[PDB]
Amino acid sequence: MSKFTIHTIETAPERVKETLRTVKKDNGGYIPNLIGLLANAPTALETYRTVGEINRRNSLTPTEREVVQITAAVTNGCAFCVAGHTAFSIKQIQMAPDLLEALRNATPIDDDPKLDTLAKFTIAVINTKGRVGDEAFADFLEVGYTPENALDVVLGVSLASLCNYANNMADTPINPELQQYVKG
Amino acid sequence: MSKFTIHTIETAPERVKETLRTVKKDNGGYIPNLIGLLANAPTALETYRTVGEINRRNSLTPTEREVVQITAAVTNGCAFCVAGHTAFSIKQIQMAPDLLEALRNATPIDDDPKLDTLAKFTIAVINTKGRVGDEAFADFLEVGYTPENALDVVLGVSLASLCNYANNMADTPINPELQQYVK
Ligand SMILES: [Cl-]
Ligand SMILES: [Cl-]
Taking CA–CA distances from A78, the nearest residue in chain B reads B129
What is the end-to-end Cα distance of chain B in Å, rounded?
24
**CATH fold label, A13-182:** AhpD-like (1.20.1290)
Residues of B in contact with A43 (CB under 8 A): 54-55, 57-59, 152, 155
CB pairs under 8 A between A and B: 156
Contacts of residue B180, defined as CB under 8 A and 6 or more positions apart, other chains included, come to: none
Inter-residue contact A75 to A126 (CB < 8 Å): yes
Q: How far apart are the CA of B47 and the centre of ligand 2, in A?
A: 20
In angstroms, rounded to a whole number, what is the distance separating the alpha carbons of residues A86 and A95?
Answer: 9
| A182 DSSP assignment | S
Please state, in angstroms and rounded to a whole number, the distance separating the CA atoms of residues B50 and B34.
15
Asked if A139 and A114 touch (Cβ cutoff 8 Å), the reply is no
Residue A36 to residue B106: CA distance in whole angstroms? 33
Amino acid at B157: V
Helix axes A97-105, A79-91, angle to 10 degrees: 170
Give the domain ranges of chain B.
13-182
Residues with beta carbon < 5 A to ion ligand 2?
B 8-9
Closest CA to B69 of B163, B166, B168: B163
Integer Cα distance of A108 and A153 in angstroms: 18
Alpha helices in A57-142 (DSSP H): 62-75, 79-91, 97-105, 113-127, 134-142
CB–CB contact A3 B137 (8 Å):
yes
Look at residues A131, A105, A133 and name the one whose alpha carbon lies nearest to residue A119. A105
Ligand that lies nearest to the alpha carbon of residue B8, given by its number in the listed order: 2
Round to whole Å and give the CA distance between B52 and B65. Answer: 10
Q: With 0-12 CB in 10 A as exposed, 13-18 as middle and 19+ as buried, what is A66?
A: buried
Give me the amino acid identity at A109.
I
d(CA A174, CA A104) in angstroms, rounded, equals: 17
